[PDB]
Structure formats: structure tokens, C-alpha cells
What we know:
alpha/beta; D-Maltodextrin-Binding Protein, domain 2; 5-stranded mixed β-sheet; 3-stranded parallel β-sheet; globular; binds the ligand CC1=N[C@H](C(=O)O)[C@@H](O)CN1; signal; plasmid; Solute-binding_3/MltF_N; Ectoine_EhuB; ectoine binding
Amino acid sequence: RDENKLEELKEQGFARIAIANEPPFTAVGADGKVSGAAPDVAREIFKRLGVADVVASISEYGAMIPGLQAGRHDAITAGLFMKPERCAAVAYSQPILCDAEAFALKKGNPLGLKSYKDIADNPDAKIGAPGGGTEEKLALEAGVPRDRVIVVPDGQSGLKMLQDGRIDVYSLPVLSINDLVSKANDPNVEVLAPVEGAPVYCDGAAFRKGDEALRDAFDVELAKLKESGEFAKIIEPYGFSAKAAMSTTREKLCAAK
Ligand SMILES: CC1=N[C@H](C(=O)O)[C@@H](O)CN1
């Protein structure tokens, strides 16, 4: 289950992957099929490694690394963006899904919220964000107090919380917000993208430190997918940029900048 992880996954027939259900990063249809850019890439690569299918678990973003280190899943494939502190806890693949950050906001933006700092500087402003995710951390880092950063389980709840006036802003990656609002059919909601002063992130498939040999194998296929253009064929129908991911590396994103 360490150096010989791939072998066991092959003779097991499947790999356990962690997702959050946030299109177009991850998605689950009523059928039960797991799609989205991250699981499709993960699915294709595992297939190439002799691993016949993926079995997915839904959880919130903050439970993913703990679940991985506890050995509950074989990889995180969910748009879990590379950050120094995350990089120190897992063995990431090379970059896959890149995106900026966005705001879902009341029409006309009554509070003038354009950066995470704007939220911090207004004591009335509450921001909705996934628990343990990048947006929550960026709000906290900009100086939004804990009790004004509100944990939101998923996009549909964030939208509803915004409509109810529980939050003044809901924050996800641009592609996630765009997808959510276009399906929302709500003239009172408005998108602000990208968030001013917020970093641009890329994710990878995240593995246990002791599963680095599996990570290497996954990466050999990722690199071949990138080289052929097949990588672009999988992720770009979802709105992602292949070039962005190919323009940087794990080490650059994991660097303390
Ligand atoms: C795809 C996605 N990634 C963020 C993260 O990696 O924390 C989450 O906070 C929100 N959605």
C-alpha cells in the first residue's frame, strides 16, 4: 500500500477519489455518474494505468486532506488548489485545472465589494465560502473576522443564502460561479470576476506522501496527455485553459511566494 500502491489498485479494479460536487470542477448527475474536469482527467489517467474505474466520495474541501492522510481515499481530484501548506501535507501531481476567484453578488453591487479587503473593511459584510477552501482563507487573510466568513456547504446553498440576505457575497472560482449563476435564473444576482487582489490558482491530483510512486505514474500519463493535446480535449469543453496549466509547475505553485 506504499511503493506498490498502483499494483493493488489494479488488482482492486478501482481508485477512491475525493470530490466536492462543484461544476465544472466536479459534477454528479442524477444517474450517479461522476463527471467534471477533475474526475474525467483522473478517470482517463487511472484507466491508462490499468485501474478500471474510479469510486468517488463527496465531502467539503476541508475534510479532503485529512481523509487522504487517514487513508480513506487514494487521491483528491476536486480542484484542490496547490498552496505551500497543502503541498507540505500531500504529494501533488503537476498542474491540471487553473482558475481565478469570483464573487456572486447582489445586482448593482450595493456594498462596492470588489476585493476581499472590501469585505474586511465593512463590518456589515458577510462572505460565504466553502469550509477549508481558498476563498475562506483569503477572506481571513485580508482581515475578515471568523464570524463574518460563513461556511457554505455547496453552490446552490450559497446562492440561496445570498438571496436570503444571510451573506452579502458568495465566493468560488470564476468557472464555478459562472456555471452556478447561469443555471440560477436570477436577475438579482451578479458576477464580479476576477476578484481584485486575489491570486490565480491551479490544482493537481493530490496523493499521500507515501504514495509518491503512484503520483509519478499518474504524472507520466498527465504529461503524455498534455503533449498530444488530449489534455486540452478533456478540460477545455469545461472552460479551463490547457496552456495556463502547461505554463507553470507544481514547484512554482508550491513555492512560498
Ligand atoms: C475548485 C475549488 N477549489 C477551492 C480550494 O481548492 O480550496 C475551493 O475553495 C472552491 N472550489
